Paper text:
Centrioles have proximal-distal polarity and a 9-fold radial symmetry imparted by a likewise symmetrical central scaffold, the cartwheel. The spindle assembly abnormal protein 6 (SAS-6) self-assembles into 9-fold radially symmetric ring-shaped oligomers that stack via an unknown mechanism to form the cartwheel. SAS-6 proteins comprise a globular “head” domain at their N-terminus followed by a long coiled coil that mediates stable protein homo-dimerization (Keller et al., 2014), and a disordered C-terminal extension. The characteristic shape of the SAS-6 ring led to the proposal that the protein head domains comprise the central “hub” of the centriolar cartwheel, with SAS-6 coiled coils forming the cartwheel “spokes” (Cottee et al., 2015; Kitagawa et al., 2011; van Breugel et al., 2011; van Breugel et al., 2014; Yoshiba et al., 2019).
In contrast, structures of the CrSAS-6_CCMiddle fragment, resolved from two different crystal forms, revealed parallel complexes featuring extensive interaction interfaces between coiled-coil domains, within each crystal’s asymmetric unit. In CrSAS-6_CCMiddle crystal form I, resolved to 2.34 Å using SeMet-derived experimental phasing two copies of the coiled-coil domain in the asymmetric unit interacted over almost their entire ∼16 nm length. The association was driven primarily via ionic and hydrogen-bonding interactions between CrSAS-6 amino acid side chains, with only a small hydrophobic contribution involving the sidechain of L339, resulting in ∼1,400 Å2 of buried solvent-accessible surface area. In crystallographic structures of the CrSAS-6 coiled coil, we showed that these domains form a unit equivalent to two cartwheel spokes merging together. They do so by associating into a parallel coiled-coil complex, the formation of which does not perturb canonical domain structure; for example, the coiled coils do not unwind or adopt a tetrameric coiled-coil arrangement. Rather, complex formation relies on ionic and hydrogen-bonding interactions interspersed along the length of the coiled coils, and is very weak in solution. We evaluated that an L339E/D378N double mutation of the CrSAS-6 coiled coil (CrSAS-6_CCLD) would have the largest impact on the symmetric interaction mode, as these substitutions remove the sole hydrophobic contact seen in the symmetric complex interface (L339-L339′), as well as two salt bridges of the same complex (D378-R377′ and the symmetry-related pair). In contrast to this prediction, however, reconstitution assays with CrSAS-6LD produced abundant cartwheels, similar to those generated using the corresponding WT protein. We surmised that amino acid substitutions that remove favorable interactions of the symmetric CrSAS-6 coiled-coil complex do not affect cartwheel formation in vitro.
Residue numbers in the entry:
A (entry chain A): 7 to 114
B (entry chain C): 10 to 114
C (entry chain B): 6 to 113
D (entry chain D): 3 to 113
Write the structure that this text describes.
Amino acid sequence: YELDTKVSELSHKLGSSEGSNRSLEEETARLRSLNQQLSSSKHELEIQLNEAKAKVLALDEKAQSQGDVIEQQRGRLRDMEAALRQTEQRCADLRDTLASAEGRAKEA
Amino acid sequence: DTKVSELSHKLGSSEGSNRSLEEETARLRSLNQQLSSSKHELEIQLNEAKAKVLALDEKAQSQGDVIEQQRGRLRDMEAALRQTEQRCADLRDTLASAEGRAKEA
Amino acid sequence: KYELDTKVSELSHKLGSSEGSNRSLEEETARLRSLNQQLSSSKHELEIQLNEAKAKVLALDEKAQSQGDVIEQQRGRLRDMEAALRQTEQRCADLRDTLASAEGRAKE
Amino acid sequence: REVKYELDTKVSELSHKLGSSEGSNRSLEEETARLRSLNQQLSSSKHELEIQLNEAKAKVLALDEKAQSQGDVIEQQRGRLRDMEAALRQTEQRCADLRDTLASAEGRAKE
């Protein structure tokens, strides 16, 4: 009788153990799948971030050079504007002198 | 007996699977909670963003309007400047001639 | 000797309870898994849509900053030219007065 | 008797089949543990990578808008520089012509 009882509790504990085993196998399968998906996403995001940071470097380079050109050409513009102001001044003076000489010639 | 033992076994596996199922149902319910909340948040941010796009597009049209209008005004102003400058040059010549006439007499 | 009959009957009963329970739970896990795949799908879709929308917002806003800078610059040039025009008009009027003087006292 | 002999054999086999099953269970529990670890740090890494990617994308949009704006300004500036080079050349030439007409006029005034 005692051996029958021990056979019984043993068969029960065994059944529970095997059922827990199928649980754990199913769960490791699920977990491996999800890990592969997540590592794939991580790798993809890594590639995209590297690309984006590179584009940041390139565009920052281009922008800085562009800024220096804008400043350079702003200076060139002020210098030109001044050169033209002065040349125009010389022309106005000449035209005054010419017009005055016309006045005296007609007065003669 | 032999069949209290085979039945003890089948009951053991039954309770084991029962635990596995309860644990998986709990995990799933929690995950649906997470994804549902996440999806509601995404919806909020998406509607906010769509609204912002419409507003910003509108303002882009307004700003583009005033930029064009101001371009046209700058062109008109350059024109009026050119014409006035020319008038001044003509006046200055008439004057200079009158001053030569004065200096001769 | 009758403890056999009571024990076996007890165990068969515990089985039909544990397995009503079980097949019910299996139903719930299948249903929940379905709702999940649909939620992950819709979440993914919303992620694509939101990312496009966020990019559009950002680009629009940056171009608005740019347009504002252009507006302010234009108004500055416009005011500078307002002053320049007013000054040139005043110069012409001055030359007109001076002209009336030179004529007036040349006639003298 | 012989029956107790069979029962002993059955208790033995059940005991060691059980022991084996528990061994498998502890191993699988360890594997499931480390797997949930990797899951957690992979997903956390993913969240962080998303945040960083979003910030970098925004920086690209700002930088690109800057480069296009500066492009327009550069082209407009070059335009006004061209026009002004031409206008300066023409004004210098016009001044030279004025000086020449001046010389000839004064020469005529002495006649």
